[PDB]
Amino acid sequence: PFTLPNLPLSSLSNSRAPLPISSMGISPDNVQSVQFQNGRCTLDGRLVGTTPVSLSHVAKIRGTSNGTVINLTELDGTPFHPFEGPAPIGFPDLGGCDWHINMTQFGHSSQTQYDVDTTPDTFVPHLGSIQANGIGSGNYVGVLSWISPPSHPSGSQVDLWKIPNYGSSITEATHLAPSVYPPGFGEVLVFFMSKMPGPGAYNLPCLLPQEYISHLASEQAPTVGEAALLHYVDPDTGRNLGEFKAYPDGFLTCVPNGASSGPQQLPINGVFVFVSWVSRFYQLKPV
Amino acid sequence: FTLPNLPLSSLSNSRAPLPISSMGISPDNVQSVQFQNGRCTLDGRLVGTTPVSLSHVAKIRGTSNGTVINLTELDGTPFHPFEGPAPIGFPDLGGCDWHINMTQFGHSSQTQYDVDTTPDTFVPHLGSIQANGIGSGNYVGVLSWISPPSHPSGSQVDLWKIPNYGSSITEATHLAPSVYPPGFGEVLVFFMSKMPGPGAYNLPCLLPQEYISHLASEQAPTVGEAALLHYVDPDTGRNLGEFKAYPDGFLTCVPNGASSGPQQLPINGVFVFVSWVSRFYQLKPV
Ligand SMILES: CC(=O)N[C@H]1[C@H](O[C@H]2[C@@H](O)[C@@H](CO)O[C@@H](O[C@H]3[C@H](O)[C@@H](O)[C@H](O)O[C@@H]3CO)[C@@H]2O)O[C@H](CO)[C@@H](O)[C@@H]1O[C@@H]1O[C@H](CO)[C@H](O)[C@H](O)[C@H]1O[C@@H]1O[C@@H](C)[C@@H](O)[C@@H](O)[C@@H]1O
């Protein structure tokens, strides 16, 4: 039968940054669809977007600075070409913020904070090039460390529901993984949340924990139905804490009991368990 | 029984968040190892300071008072000596100085924390390590790069070691037990990664992190004396070598002489469980 990891959510990682999962949640009123490029894996094991199998590749960059630009490669140094995607595998996908990436080197001492505004014309990872912003010549590996409000537009909020502008303009085609929409029926998308360091109470959402991605990529389920009915289970008591659906494209939903009672009010130490394949129209009991 | 159907080169070290770049054997001045991270038995028992998730690997959390950092678990839960040699996920890289990147919830900026693990102030088993200039506050830290140990002065990096978690080398810290080569011409197999810093630093571990989460999820009900495995090229399906996985959570093979061992294998293959065999099942070299 089809399986999800038999691991409690609070033991798992975000798939958009190497951070422990601290809660589940729903999106703000002003967010309907999302278009995350990391943390995208179908139920039959197809990785989508810039998603890697391993957290060791998540929210990382690799490239060589000439003092003006950083020419990007894949994490292992392999060339990256525009046809391959919006950015190299694992490249950070946090829109709506400035990044602070910790840069280190193979064969040299020290780390350097690389400050990334993802809005200027020089930020073109789809074409393999981003501004150096004072990073001296050399080859670096970088990992996202902390975030802050965007440099532009001035006074913008931190909005992690967004993805960055990977192309030379927002109108350049960059081979983005497609958007994910709430499927209707009163079902809402479920997000796995992590606290992100920086000068505010930042919470990073993703569609699946990273360990779900490696699990599904390994499992390569030969049978995927229209929707998987799941129970969110307390491992000790075995109590079913609520019904959820997982959809083939790689996301979970539930029907909240009301505005103040939904997946965010459930304990975070539960385990999602596959129950059965159901119709896409299967109506869930509110959680 | 299953292992991940994933190529090794797609996976992570379990002692630091680094891609796997090769398999290797131990140096000839190392017979046994005692890593505290990357320890999981075949039936899914986490051992030492090993976490389920790479998001906890080689990380620290604690509050500096400017003199010491008082440690907690990564989620802020108290850590007590009876629980182990250090909080879950705490770095286990001996034979080097650490440079840890410290960040804070609710504050800007990062700070490099330089850790000599040799002085008597380095007592993570008792929940305390020297601040070494880290100002007052609560931090989460992740290992960023390493350098040669400050003591003994002039020594080389040696990642086959673990640090001194106790108040002295004689203090009992509830270390996970050592892993020994099991006999029958078999060698311990290590999954290797390259660690940033001023040298060519090679970090070994006993299992990729994704194997840890897989085994911890799977909770195999029927573990035998040893699992016979094949290392397989996925496309071609070719068996590249017979290996054994042992219940305590390590792999072995028999090298084909001094010239040909795990290091000579390509790193894009997949370990596949074949059958349970006896502990003394004799492997074919390679
Ligand atoms: C660039 C920077 O650090 N900006 C942050 C700003 O920093 C000011 C303080 O350091 C202040 C201390 O007295 O000095 C200001 O500089 C003055 C000099 O003092 C003065 O002698 C000289 O004549 O004039 C200059 C002004 O031209 C610094 O600008 O502090 C802010 C409040 O803490 C902080 O929010 C700001 O951080 C940047 O904020 C924008 C949004 O506005 C973006 O999020 C940026 O990403 C963010 O920068 C990032 O964080 C800072 C703390 C630092 O780590 C940067 O490297 C990083 O990119």
Ligand SMILES: [Mg+2]
């Ligand atoms: Mg689960």
Ligand SMILES: [Mg+2]
């Ligand atoms: Mg494998």
